[PDB]
Every structure is written in C-alpha cells, then in structure tokens.
Design a protein around this nucleic acid. Structure first.
Lengths: 149, 104, 42, 153, 70, 187, 148, 85, 68
RNA sequence: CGAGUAUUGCAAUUAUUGGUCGCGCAACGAGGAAUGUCUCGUAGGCGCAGCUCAUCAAACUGUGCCGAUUACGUCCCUGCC
RNA sequence: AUUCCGUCAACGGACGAGAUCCAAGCUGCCCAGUAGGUGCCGGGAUUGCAGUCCCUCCGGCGGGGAUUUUUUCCCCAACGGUGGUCGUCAUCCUUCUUUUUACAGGCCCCUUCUCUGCGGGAUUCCUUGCUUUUCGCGCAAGGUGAGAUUUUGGGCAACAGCAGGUCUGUGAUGCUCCUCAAUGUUCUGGGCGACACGCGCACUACAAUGUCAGUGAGAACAAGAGU
C-alpha cells in the first residue's frame, strides 16, 4: 500500500496542507488575533504569515500521532531556547491564547477531535485526505529521479 | 476461587532486610493456597546529601555527600484474604516497610 | 530569605542544612548520617 | 532577488517624520528609528501598514511613507493595539500613548525630574547614575568609570 | 605493576604447597581451584592467585623454578 | 567496490602523490566520516583514522557554543562537490594531492637548557607530516571564512583549491614553506 | 492472526547504545522490503543516519543484504548512538533468524562480512555525559586557580 | 563602524561591491556570468563582486528556473550549479 | 627537492627533554649513485610515527646523534 | 529604560520575580603584559535535573545532548619522593 | 607503588601501600515478575496499468540478422536461474469492539527487551615478542578477548605534623564580659546590597562559524500530597 502522514514530508506536505486550509478558505485567524508573537519568547515572530495554518498543520501533525494530546503538550512542542542577556542561555515560553485557538480551530475544521473532550486525536477523514495529499505532492520534485522513469 | 490480587509491596532502607522479609512470608503464606506471580521490584529511590563541612574561615571550603538508596520489592498474589490474614501474623522488623493491598 | 527556619536541632537560621524537612546544623547533619542511613556516594 | 536594473528604487537615506531611514534593512529597523525612547515602529504598526522585506528600507517608496505616517499616530485607530502602547497611563492625560519624537523628550524631562524629585534610595539609585539593582553596586559602572562622583565640601 | 603481591605470590604458591600438584596450567580451573581450596575473600584476588598459579605451574612445568619444589 | 566519496568519487583510482608520505595517512575509501573510536593517548592509534575524519573535527570550536561535528561534514561535501566541478578533480584527487603538497618534511626542534632557547634540525615524520598537513590546510581555510563573513563555504573550498595546486595563496602552504625554510634557517 | 501470503516466522532484537534504544523484528513472506518508521528503507529519507547505516549493501549490492524484512521502531538520543544501536540489533536479528532459518555457512558469512565493516555490533561507547567532579563542578577540569 | 572599538590586536579585512541593489550592469552581467563559469556557485557570483552569494544565489535560482545554470542537489540551500549546456 | 626516501627502520628512542624528538635509524631506498639500499643513516625525527615508515629525507647524509 | 498588566511577601519602599510593548546602535568586533585550567563518547560545547527557595542564582550538586589534537613522551621547565 | 624478586644482622611482627568497599561497563535467565515492562491475539483493504509479478539479462542446447565471423553485437524461443519497471522477505485501512461517565482492538495470549534481586566474568590467562638470571620477580606487543591497565570512577585509608581555620553550628566548652534604666528579649525600623576605584572568580557579548522566521516524530537524571 502506501504513504500516509506516517510516511510523508511536511516540508512539502504541511507546506501544502497549510494551503489546504488556505486555498480553500476553511478556517483562518480568530477574531481576537492575527498579529502573532512567536510566543512569549520573541518579537520577531512569524515571517510566514501563515503561521496559524502552519500551527494547525502542526497541531494536526501532533493529534494523529499522540492521540490525546492536551493543551499543555502543545505548549511543549512549541519549544525554544533563550539568550536572556549577560545571563543564562536557557529554554523559552509558548503563548497559549493562540495555542488554544489552534485547538479550537482544527476541531472546528474537523481534522482534530477533542478526544475524551480533552486531548486531541484525529478525524478519520483528515488522515485519508492527508495521505491523498501526500501522494499528490510527492511525485513531481525539483530534485533527482523519477517523473521520467 | 475468588482470588484477591494481593500486592505486598516491600520498600526498605536497604535491599537486604526486606528480601528476607519478603521471602519468608511468601513461603509461609504459600504452603499452599497463596498463589503468587513472581516478585517485581519498582525503582530504587535515592536520597542525596552534600554538605559544606569545615568552618574554614580559612582553609578549603570543600564539601562532602551521603546517600540513602531505598529499595522497592513487590509481589502479587491471587490468593485468599483470610489465609493472607492468617499468615499476616508476623511482627516484622523495621527498615522494611511492607504494605499489603487488595486491588485486582 | 533568612529569618523563618529556626533549625529544629538548633533554633538557627545560619549553620542549618535546609534539606528535606530536617532543620539540623551542618555539623549535626554530619553527625547523623548513620542512624538515618546516608552513606557516601561521592 | 530580481533582475531589476533600477537606480531610483535603489534608494536611500532619508529623514522623514522627524526620523532617519536608511537604505537597505530587511525593512524593520529603518522603521525602528528615532529613539528617545520608543518611537514607534511597534514593529507591528509598520508591518501592519503593509510594509515588508519586499521593499526593504532601501526601496524607499514615498507612498509608503505617507501610509506609515498615517498609521503610526493613531495606532489603535488602525486597531494596532493599545495594550502595548509605550505609554499607557500618562499621568496628565492619565493615558495611553504611542509616543513619538521630541514629545517623548519633553515627556522624559518632566516625568523624570518629579519621579526622581520625591526621593528615596531606590529613586536615586536609577537617577544619580546607577543600575537600579545589582546588590554590590560599585562593581557595576565598569569602564564608564566615573558614575559621576559627588562631594558637598 | 603486574607484580603479583607478596600475599598473592604466597597464596598461589601456598596452594600448590598444601595442595600438591594437581591443577592445570589453565587459569580457568586453576581459578576454580582457587575458589575451591581456600576460603578466601575477593574474586580478583583468587583470580590473580589463579593467574599466577597457572603461571607458576607453567614454569614449574618446565622446572623446579627458583625456590620451589614437590 | 571501494566506497565512493559522497556517492561520487572513486579513491582506488587515486593514490598518494608523494614518494614518502603515502603510507601513514589512513585512507579507507568511504561515503562518510566519524563514528566513535578512542585513538588519542597512544602514538599508534591516531593512524587508523583516515584523512577525512580529521577533517570532520577540524573546522571549528568556539569559546562556548560548539560541538557541531555534524555540520562540518555537509558543507564540506558541498565545497568538495563544487571543487570537483571547479577543478574537475575527484576530491580524493584533490585531498590526496593537497596532502601530498601541504605536508612539510623537515622542521626545527627546540632543545632548551635552563630556559635558554636553542634549536636544531628535526626531520619531519611522515605521520607528523599528516598531522601537520591536515592541521595546516584547515587552519588557513579557517582563517579567511572567519572574521568578516568570508564564508566557510567559499573559503574552505578556496583553500583546498589552492592546496592541490600547492598555491602560495593559502596560509597552509605558507606555513609549510615557512617551516621547511625556517629549519634550513635555524642552521 | 495475519498469515501474509501464508507466512512463517519471526525473531526480535534490540539495540541500545548510550541512552538511546531501538527495537527490531525479522520475518519472511512474498517479495523484498525492509522498513524504517513504517516505510521501505531505499525509500526512507533522513539521509543523515540512513546513509550512515547502509553502506555494506549500498557500496556493493543489496542482494546479499535485503534478503528479508526487518521492521524497526525507535526511542533515543544518542541519535547516532541509536544508529549504532540499530545496526547492532539488526545484526543480531540477522543471525538469530539465521541460526534457525538457515545454517552456518550463510550465518557465518553474513556475520563475517558484517563484522568486517562493523560499527560496534558488540560494543559500548560506554558513556555519553560523565558524573561531575564536585568542587569544581566539572569532569576533568577545575575552578580557576587564582594563584594570588 | 560607528563603534569606537570593535576591532582586535592584528585582524584586517577590506570591502566588497556586492549589494541589495538593482543595476543594469549587474543584471545584464549576471546573465552573462551565469553561463560563464563551468561550475557556477552563488559564491563565485559574490566573488565577482557585483552581487553577494546570497541574493546572487537567488539570481542563480531565478536564472536556474530559467535553466541558465544547472541546480545540482536534489533539494535546495547547498545546491550548486554548473553552467548550462 | 631532496626527498631522498629512506625508510625509518628503527625507532631508536626518545631524546631531548621535551619528549618530542626521536632518534631513528633510516635505511635508504635508493641513494643517488650507489646500489639501492644498504646505506644506513640515522636521522632524528619528530614524534608521531614509527619504524618502517617513510621519511622524505632532506639533509640526508647529515645523521643525527645528540638532542641537547 | 519608559509607561503598562500579572504574581511573591506582613512589608520591597536598598525596584522580590515575571509580564508587555516600545526601546536602545552604552561597553562590547573576541581583549595587552600577563594569565587559568586540561590528554576519552572524552576536552569541550551544549543544554537539563536537584536544592537554596515566601519570592529570587550565572552558586551549589547532579543529569543529559552533542562531540575531538598530540602527549603518550620526556624530564627539561616547574615541582614532589 | 613500602609493588615484588633478590640481595642481604636481622629476625620477626604491626598499620599504612597492596588490599577492601560503593559505584561502572558485557550477561538466550544462571535468579523472579510486571493488572506503572515488550510480542502473532480483532475485524476489514494493498498504494504514474511502465509494480506486487514476470524471468536472454546470463548460461546450457539453439536460430535469424548485423558483425573484425574470436561465447563480437542486436533480436529471439524453450529451459533454468539471474535479470526486468517504485512498490506486496508482505503493505494498508478500520483501530475490533467498546466503556452507566474523560474510556473506547483482539486475545488462546507470549515472554524477550522494563524495574531490580542472584550470579557471572580478565588471569597481563594465551600467543608471540625482550633467550634478561643459570634460575627471576618481571615487562611489551599480539590473541582469544563485552571487557585488558593497580580494567572503570569513586569511597576508604598511615604516621607525625600545621597556637591554620574552627566563638558563624553546637543543648563541646576555659578564662573573660552584660543580665533589664543589659549589648538579654522582643518590637519597630534600619543596615551589611551604600560607587573614585584595585581586585578574585563567574556569566555574556562582540556574531554567519551568525543573528531572525519557521520547521525537526530528539529523554536523561531526577523531583512532589507533614503533624
């Protein structure tokens, strides 16, 4: 058989699935937001304006895999380290409003589901669609072999 | 029978004393209706203490560390409760906490 | 912060090792490791 | 990068809205300019007006400038938020302000002298010339060596 | 220093001395032997004894090595 | 099938272009370097590592902030690739050669008595030479890329580029020369 | 209970190397692949380690090698140390399957060839990250001596 | 620099002509230099001082999506080029 | 160029007082103007290496004794 | 560093700490004469436990992740038997 | 190695050094489990058709064509096996079901990775290499060899010695002070944290070797609910 989300590079795929939520106009930003700090760790923040999709892509990436991943988990996958100043070189802070948005939105997108009203785990449909997407992107590469085999 | 998963959990200030405990009770309890699936032992917990020694004022401000590892042994039995209680008539020493629990 | 410990061996804020509900002076701790069971690790 | 051959978009270095704007820049810190103190990029205000790397500071379009000038001084008119707003409770308006320019200077003088004027150790510590902490305060002042020095004799 | 200590040498010796002959030149049984003909303390020490016992025999095997006999 | 350098170069269709250096260098044909393996504290061990592994460590350190052995190998693969496209040469045919040129065969020895500093002619070991060579090549490379972004991707390549030529234009060959000169200077 | 084109039989090994631990399964059924993180290895894409682990098949030919599937799952940094662990487990998988599913001369060759290009099938890079030296709070080194 | 210090005991480095800009010569040159070398790298563009290896490399990508130079690694970043045939 | 290639034949040992130098007996491969081999020279090396190994002899007849 | 919000504490007013957004081009482009430590998954970097702890460490005491020259000698120097 | 031989006006002993001990690395159980370990256990599909499947690609026995006609090359049958164009030493889905309340495969089940208790194992054992002495106590290199060296990191550790330091523990204290219009004690409030500067450690930056925006399926080791 084939290549699902378990088998596929988001480097092409999230970059496309981001677009699945974009291109289609399914969910986008919430009313409360659209500015976006990196999270409490940084000003410079999303050069990619698509961060929330990307986020959604990634919360979704989480949710099929770690079925039942709560709010607090999303804070952690968020990661980073901080050079504070003439001070320690120590790990960073995840902004929860938006985390919580992402959670609200992918479930509204019906790709996420609040498993046991909590930690999210995927919609069936999500992952078939993901695998579908995976194949479409996969084949036509700007690398080496096989659009001509 | 209507077994009881008995968990007799034995945590001890050394591994030493408790194994002695563990074994003998089980031997005693067993013989015969006490039926046990072999003893599993949960992580030895360790207590660390480093101290600033010396009241060097002057001389080396060097520091020394004592430790107490605490050893956990568990055996589970699918056994009779009254029999358990019949064998449970051991006054047992210290340094060996032994807990007995009846879940399933 | 240094005024609420009052070492239960010694009433002391200073000299007392602050560790795991204990309140003994550093010396007192050095004296006690055996009955308690702490043996050198390093 | 583009294959554009242009000289009038290779642009520079212009002082606008009582600021300075250099050429080049990913765009941000040209916009960051004028200090004394936070003057008022917000990053966000300017980024929110529709400015970017796709022009850099170096592209330097007039059009843009007008749009910035417009967005900046009523930042939360542009909904560009007020929860950050370098000044938020004045004390003579008692309020909010995206403070700009020399009026921040003005604001600096007035407020710093009073803030300083009602005195206290803490007060003087930021005021006369110290880092407002460091316990062992003398060590700080490193190679600026002369905090100011004072004697009343 | 892969000097067989005095205590060692004495012991490896001594075991042939009280427990004549037998052995091997093999450490392995001579090892077992060390366990078996003494009531010694640390393994290392037995093995070391053993290694030498193998040794001492190995040159006894070719002689009545300096100071030694049966 | 002697492993081929990054997928893309045979080594057993190269050899050391030196008349003496040739042995010491370890040079098993590969696809990648570094792995675990305690050489260090004995003179012998150092040998088994081939040339490229030495390279794999060799590009960097920082006061605080390094360890990134990982990196070095990818970029290097890229400079070499280019270099192959730049000189047409196999990077074996580049390194081997570079080595063969950049390795000084006589150096000056310090034999000091009571703090007084005299020196004598010491004939550089083939192993010492490899050690030297590697050390040297990269040192110069590292030199440019450094300070004001002369670009490690640009510089390293440019160094080795000059090393297989044996160019003057390389801090490496500068030192290599200096040392042979200097030993001949010392006496 | 499965049955995969009427299949017959597995063996299991683990690799740990430093902190890092991977666990491996070898078994036969009706063609050719060998899968990492759910998908065939000629097809798995971290180059980083992948390219580190293949070389005996890859420089020389895979037919001697890709003879069976090994399905593998991972937890462990020591990322590399994990790699070396994986291979080791793999090696272990090969032989155990082979003791039973072949005979010695192939079991011995496979091994021989393996050992011959071995990245530490049977050894430990014994540590990762050292017990401090207290006082100095370090591993060999030392708070400066300030001399005087 | 504006900095009073910010410079060591021995180190010295001179300036390049690479920039953000848009220039007739640059663009046109780029078209004639991007063929020119047998291997074409972003770095060599930088080295011919008109445009640095960064955006010049983009110049190479956006000449190489026009095929002018052949993108080698089967991916991005540390791709490189050779002149096209 | 005078590479004269002589094989380090013997590591004679370490002299000097830095632990750095080693005296070595080298047996020439061919020595210009003589039957190849069987011409012995002592050169004194710098560390890393061993006997059997091939030095590209620069001051070839200049044999080395004392490193003091 | 400036308003601005949250938290500690009886009390911070010798800013307890955070937070926020602005905001900086301080010094500082890697540091002289000098100079400190160091020879194996380790130097070393890199990070994290663990406690001081109302509240607060760059400390403390660990943990990890990553990951190496030649030295292996020499006994000079500098020092101990 | 105060480690041994050996020599030897000592002889004999002792504590140190050995040595020990904790911790450390290898361990089809050689210890016993896991209802806080790991496994066929469910039920259903296989994702550019050039693939799972098939076999001149090769060779044996052949034929045609081209050919320097020599197993020269192409095409090609049968045969066999390689070979063949991504994939089925088997891939996927659906998690089978399903739970009177944050759970939602299967299990006859299967012990193997998991804690942690037992217990192994290296001896320079061996080979070879220094024919040392005549013998040697030894030593190197190489081997078996997870693991080779006083194996690992410690812990322990002699004897004297140092008005060190130790009034900042001490409910160890001389001698020696106050004892309440005390410097006790509480309380309050302060301070030790005050900046010309001289230092000692640390920490950080100065930077593409970097910075930024984002993206990465990375576990140590080890915490916590007092009466």
């Amino acid at each position: 058989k084939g290549a699902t989300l378990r088998d596929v590079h988001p480097w092409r795929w999230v970059k496309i699935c981001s677009q699945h939520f974009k291109q289609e106009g399914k969910m986008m930003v919430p009313n409360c937001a659209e500015i976006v700090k990196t999270s409490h760790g940084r000003e410079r923040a999303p050069q990619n304006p698509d961060w929330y999709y990307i986020r959604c892509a990634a919360v979704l990436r989480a949710v099929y895999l770690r079925p039942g991943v709560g709010y607090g988990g999303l804070s952690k996958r968020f990661s980073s380290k901080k050079n504070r100043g003439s001070r320690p070189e120590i790990t960073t802070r995840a902004s929860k409003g938006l985390l919580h948005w992402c959670c609200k939105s992918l479930t509204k997108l019906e790709l996420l589901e609040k498993c046991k009203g909590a930690g999210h785990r995927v919609t069936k449909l999500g992952r078939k669609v993901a695998d579908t997407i995976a194949f479409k992107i996969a084949l036509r590469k700007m690398g080496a072999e096989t659009k001509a085999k | 029978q209507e077994t009881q998963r008995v968990l007799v959990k034995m945590t001890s200030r050394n591994a030493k004393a408790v194994e002695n405990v563990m074994t003998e009770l089980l031997l005693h309890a067993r013989n015969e209706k006490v039926v046990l699936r072999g003893p599993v032992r949960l992580p030895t917990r360790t207590l660390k203490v480093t101290t600033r020694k010396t009241p060097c004022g002057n001389g080396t401000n060097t520091w020394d560390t004592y430790e107490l590892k605490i050893y956990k042994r568990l055996v589970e039995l699918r056994a009779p409760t009254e029999l358990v209680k019949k064998i449970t008539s051991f006054p047992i020493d210290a340094g060996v906490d032994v807990a007995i629990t009846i879940p399933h | 912060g240094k005024g609420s410990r009052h070492c239960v061996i010694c009433s002391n804020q200073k000299a007392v090792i602050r560790k795991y509900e204990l309140n003994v002076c550093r010396q007192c701790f050095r004296e006690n490791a055996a009955n308690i069971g702490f043996s050198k690790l390093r | 990068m583009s294959l554009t051959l242009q000289s009038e978009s290779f642009q520079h270095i212009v002082r606008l809205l009582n600021t300075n704007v250099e050429g080049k820049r990913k765009v941000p810190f040209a916009l960051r300019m004028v200090k004394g103190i936070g003057i008022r990029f917000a990053y966000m205000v300017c980024k929110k007006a529709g400015v970017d790397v796709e022009r850099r500071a170096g592209t330097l379009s007039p059009e843009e400038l007008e749009k910035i000038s417009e967005v900046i001084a009523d930042p939360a008119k542009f909904k560009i938020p007020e929860w950050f707003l370098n000044r938020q409770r004045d004390p003579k308006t008692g309020k909010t302000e995206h403070l700009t320019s020399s009026m921040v200077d003005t604001r600096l003088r007035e407020d710093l002298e009073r803030l300083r004027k009602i005195r206290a150790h803490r007060g003087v510590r930021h005021a006369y010339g110290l880092r407002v902490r460091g316990q062992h305060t003398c060590t700080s002042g490193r190679r600026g060596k002369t905090v100011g020095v004072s004697r009343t004799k | 220093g892969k000097i067989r200590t005095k205590t060692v040498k004495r012991a490896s010796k001594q075991i042939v001395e009280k427990y004549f002959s037998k052995l091997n030149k093999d450490f392995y049984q001579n090892k077992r032997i060390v366990m078996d003909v003494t009531i010694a303390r640390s393994k290392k020490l037995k093995n070391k004894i053993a290694g030498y016992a193998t040794h001492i025999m190995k040159r006894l095997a070719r002689g009545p090595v300096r100071g030694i006999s049966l | 099938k002697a492993p081929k350098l990054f997928n893309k170069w045979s080594y057993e269709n190269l050899q050391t272009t030196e008349i003496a250096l040739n042995d010491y260098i370890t040079r098993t044909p590969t696809y990648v370097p570094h792995s675990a393996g305690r050489w260090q504290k004995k003179r012998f061990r150092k040998a088994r590592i081939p040339i490229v592994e030495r390279l794999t460590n060799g590009l960097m350190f920082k006061g605080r902030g390094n360890g990134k052995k990982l990196q070095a190998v990818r970029l290097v693969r890229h400079t070499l690739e280019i270099i192959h496209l730049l000189t047409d040469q196999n990077p074996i045919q580049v390194v081997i050669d570079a080595v063969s040129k950049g390795a000084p065969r006589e150096d000056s020895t310090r034999v000091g008595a009571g703090g007084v500093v005299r020196r004598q002619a010491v004939d550089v070991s083939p192993m010492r030479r490899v050690n030297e060579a590697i050390y040297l090549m990269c040192k110069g490379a590292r030199e440019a890329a450094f300070r004001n972004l002369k670009t490690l991707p640009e510089c390293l390549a440019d160094e080795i580029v000059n090393a297989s030529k044996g160019s003057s234009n390389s801090y490496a060959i500068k030192k290599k020369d200096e040392v042979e000169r200097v030993a001949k200077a010392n006496r | 209970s499965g049955e995969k084109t009427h299949t017959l039989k597995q063996v299991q090994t683990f690799g740990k190397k430093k902190t890092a631990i991977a666990v491996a399964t070898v078994t036969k059924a009706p063609q050719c692949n060998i899968r990492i993180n759910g998908v065939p290895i000629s097809q798995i894409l971290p180059e980083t380690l992948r390219a580190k682990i293949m070389e005996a098949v890859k420089v020389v030919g895979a037919r001697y090698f890709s003879r069976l599937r090994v399905d593998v799952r991972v937890r462990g940094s020591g990322q590399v140390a994990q790699a070396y662990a994986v291979r080791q487990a793999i090696a272990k998988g090969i032989i155990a399957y082979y003791q039973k599913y072949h005979n010695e001369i192939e079991k011995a060759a496979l091994k021989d060839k393996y050992l011959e290009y071995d990245k530490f099938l049977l050894i430990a890079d014994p540590r990762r990250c050292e017990p401090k030296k207290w006082g100095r709070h370090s591993a060999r080194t030392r708070f400066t001596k300030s001399y005087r | 620099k504006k900095a009073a210090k910010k410079w060591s005991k021995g180190r010295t480095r001179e300036a390049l002509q690479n920039a953000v800009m848009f220039d007739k010569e640059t663009m046109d040159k780029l078209m004639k230099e991007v063929p020119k070398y047998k291997v074409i790298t972003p770095s060599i563009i930088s080295d011919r001082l008109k445009i640095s290896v960064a955006l010049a490399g983009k110049g190479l990508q956006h000449l190489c999506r026009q095929g002018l130079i052949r993108l080698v690694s089967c991916s991005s970043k540390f791709r490189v080029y050779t002149r096209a045939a | 160029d005078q590479a004269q290639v002589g094989v380090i034949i013997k590591v004679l040992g370490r002299t000097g007082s830095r632990g750095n130098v080693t005296q070595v007996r080298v047996r020439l491969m061919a020595e210009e103007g003589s039957p190849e081999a069987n011409r012995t020279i002592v050169r004194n090396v710098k560390g890393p290496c061993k006997e059997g190994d091939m030095l590209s002899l620069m001051e070839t007849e200049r044999e080395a004794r004392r490193l003091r």
